[PDB]
Assembly symmetry: C3
Homo-oligomer: 114 residues x 3
């Protein structure tokens, strides 16, 4: 799985250990080993949500499976919870795009996961 | 809707008010309330279009609905027109990926839109 | 086609000529003319892969067609090879999301490719 968060919160406001925490919580949430979890945090971005430049986040989770109605509600409670607690971003200023990838459409290690 | 523009135009060339203009015009074009519009502009990027590093933009618009052939043509005229007028990027050096999201696949406010 | 690479490798480790090399090799691999290939490299990123922060890359290739199981394996060999040779990233620390776009869902030059 690949989780990306783009935010206007400054780099200094991202706690040490945030990438590790995302890695662990997403391994637990998706049930995939941590070795397959990739995380990417992009602070200091020029962005707005609803016209406002208060703190916000635009995110995506790409996963081969483990994407669906109930799972995505649970992921959203988890991830909004982490962004609120660690980055002080209100959950209603977060979008997360969930993307269920086909294994043949994910490249890794000179081939695909098919 | 979530609109992202990545460009090699320098930050100083992005005019004040641009994120607001994008928000307002995307709300009108998609019909969505402006409170649901998120916008994100990433200048100073290392990119090329057609092998050339003249000004260009690589963009995406994700939306729950309001994506389709005729709608997307209209969005492209709007968004290319704004990028030409405000960032001086030629329309034929812009790509925009349009992505129709299922409501169950968009997290927001601790849940999803389903 | 649009190819994006996000990486924690520093900007000074991206060699001169890399965006051109990506443009040329992707033109040859997808069979589309280089005038239509866009490329984007984003260095110095805050990211982890598998819980650690040795060099890694999170990438995407969006293309109107020319996406499929065998094609994508060949693209992955090519692109992991380039990232290893030029940015010293291990192929087992690269993820590439392949996305087959409908022509009507790609904006360009004030309209779409439909």
């Amino acid at each position: 799985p690949m989780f990306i968060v783009n935010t206007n919160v400054p780099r200094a406001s991202v706690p040490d250990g945030f990438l590790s925490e995302l890695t662990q919580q997403l391994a637990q949430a998706t049930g995939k080993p941590p070795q397959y979890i990739a995380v990417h945090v992009v602070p200091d971005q020029l962005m707005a949500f609803g016209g406002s430049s208060e703190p916000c986040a635009l995110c995506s989770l790409h996963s081969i499976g483990k994407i669906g109605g109930a799972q995505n509600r649970s992921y959203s409670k988890l991830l909004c919870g982490l962004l609120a607690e660690r980055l002080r971003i209100s959950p209603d200023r977060v979008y997360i795009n969930y993307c269920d990838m086909n294994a043949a459409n994910v490249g890794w290690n000179n081939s695909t996961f098919a």
